[PDB]
Ligand binder design. Sequence first.
Ligand SMILES: [Mg+2]
Ligand SMILES: [Mg+2]
Ligand SMILES: [Mg+2]
Ligand SMILES: [Mg+2]
Lengths: 233, 118, 102, 67
Amino acid sequence: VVNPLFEKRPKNFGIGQDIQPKRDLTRFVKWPRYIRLQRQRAILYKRLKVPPAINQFTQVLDRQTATQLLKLAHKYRPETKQEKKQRLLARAEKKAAKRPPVLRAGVNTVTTLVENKKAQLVVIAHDVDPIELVVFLPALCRKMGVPYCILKGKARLGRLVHRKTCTTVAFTQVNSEDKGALAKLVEAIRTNYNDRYDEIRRHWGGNVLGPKSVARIAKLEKAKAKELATKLG
Amino acid sequence: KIRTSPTFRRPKTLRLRRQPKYPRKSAPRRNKLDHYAIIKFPLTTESAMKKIEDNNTLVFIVDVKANKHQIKQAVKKLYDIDVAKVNTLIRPDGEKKAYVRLAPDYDALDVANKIGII
Amino acid sequence: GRVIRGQRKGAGSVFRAHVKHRKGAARLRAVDFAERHGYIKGIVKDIIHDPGRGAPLAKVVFRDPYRFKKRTELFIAAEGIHTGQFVYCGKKAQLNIGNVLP
Amino acid sequence: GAYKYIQELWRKKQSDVMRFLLRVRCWQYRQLSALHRAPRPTRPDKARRLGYKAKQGYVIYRIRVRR
RNA sequence: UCAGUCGGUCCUGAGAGAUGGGCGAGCGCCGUUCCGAAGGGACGGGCGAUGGCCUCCGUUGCCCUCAGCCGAUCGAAAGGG
RNA sequence: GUGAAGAUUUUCACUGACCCGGUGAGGCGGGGGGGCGAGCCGGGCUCUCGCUUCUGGCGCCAAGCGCCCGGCCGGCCGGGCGCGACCCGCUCCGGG
Ligand SMILES: [Mg+2]
Ligand SMILES: [Mg+2]
Ligand SMILES: [Mg+2]
Ligand SMILES: [Mg+2]
């Protein structure tokens, strides 16, 4: 019932025997200089001995706690321009015929309300292009006793406010029904960051070799160790 | 999707056309090279008259910026006479002398004596 | 004083090499997977005299393993080679006159 | 105010924290061309005290000079 | 002093010369493939619009797919043409 | 710049700054899988290979399999995906 003319002719992709197929070459592409630069910069970050003051941002909050924090933060979002206009219109007509607590954005605003311990929680983005903007903030919060946590993504941190990016968001006051959840989050954040600051400042980063260098060293030490211990006894 | 070629080239992007909020010039420039200024004056030399009386052609003095097609169309519109061919040269004085060979039906002698040159 | 001829030879004004009639630089094929693991065979199509060069050149044509084309290259001719000879280039190429191996 | 901490930190260039940033920035800028535009200033506080304001119309060009 | 057919106009030789880049206080200089995201193209297929006996095709607009080149450009009225 | 040894210094190391070479930056480092020899009790470890050498021919734009989807009347026409062509990685490979 099968046509006998349907044979199979397999290609033999040997050396010098057949044309090499168009396979995946995603590793050997001569990438543009900007792509090359933004990749080897991350390589250099993993290579060089990153100081603890900078590497502290690499250690970040876990996923479940992060999304729980976002759920809490979604309650106190600031007013947009249109609804702020609506509020002003409502007050104007009400007068013709109390503000709730909200988030505290901006690094300058946050550090001013932290240095006088007027805030209960601080959330810091881990991906500021200059780290010098927020490098001192974890130490400042530790000395002032204000709980602080590090969150991955300034974009998702900046989506709490209705702008593009925001370095830091501060919780200064919460409503009664969210007081318990805020306190539960605060104690866990304090244990993660504030209570382990000595280890944080003692924890350097980077100083990791590449996979080829690790492999060659590992096989070298494996060969010498297996030729030493096994034969000796 | 995967990359086959080991080289990377700029992806082709979408580019739009000009939609200015105002025309750069208020009005298009008037055609200064019209059918009246393309031809200046026919020659009245004895050689020209000997040529019109033998080869059934005409001689004109025109500007240097006129093509043979433009001369043919201008003569056709100004005098309602079919043109067989045009031969143009630039005189040492600077003006362009154009020989306009007419179609066999028309007669150069009649055209010349009805446009003035005789 | 006037700058000497030895100094004037570095400016490359009239002392540049005459490289018009030269057929090209005699370079071995670039190192690739074929030579690094196996071998690639080519045919000696012709042998050419390179003007201004004391050694003859041999134009060897290989088959490109990555696309359908026939690459042509010029090697320094080793005496004993001839047109129509198969020249093998790579790690696995055996030891004989003409072949090039690491 | 954040800018006070920033300028105090920048005055401590010889420390390891700033030295790592300086060498990383210096290498990255060396990889780029001699004349190019940075979308945002590298030093906000220093730009502000030099007169820069974060408003449309002010741009920053990072240029390299052979020492 | 009249040209499709005679030449220039086209091509490129030795060379010259921008862009990338680098240098330079600076006018600018070096450099010609080198520290480059260097393709404005296309057999074919799909989506959508127009015209003509809306048959079939053409112009398109968008997407898929394919694509090497060697460097923009100038350089001979005795070289090729 | 990062380490290990000897007494701030010397030697031996690493690359990551910096330098050179190749390319159309075309198969790099490991792991897995498939054979070829050695030595133990059908099985385990180390190591090796990875398909082309009698000749001036040809070789690209996939056959084959498996799984989905469309239109038309079990049959007809026309598509998509994966293995075929192993997986994961942080520098394109090399030499300083
Ligand atoms: Mg004729
Ligand atoms: Mg120049
Ligand atoms: Mg020309
Ligand atoms: Mg000629």
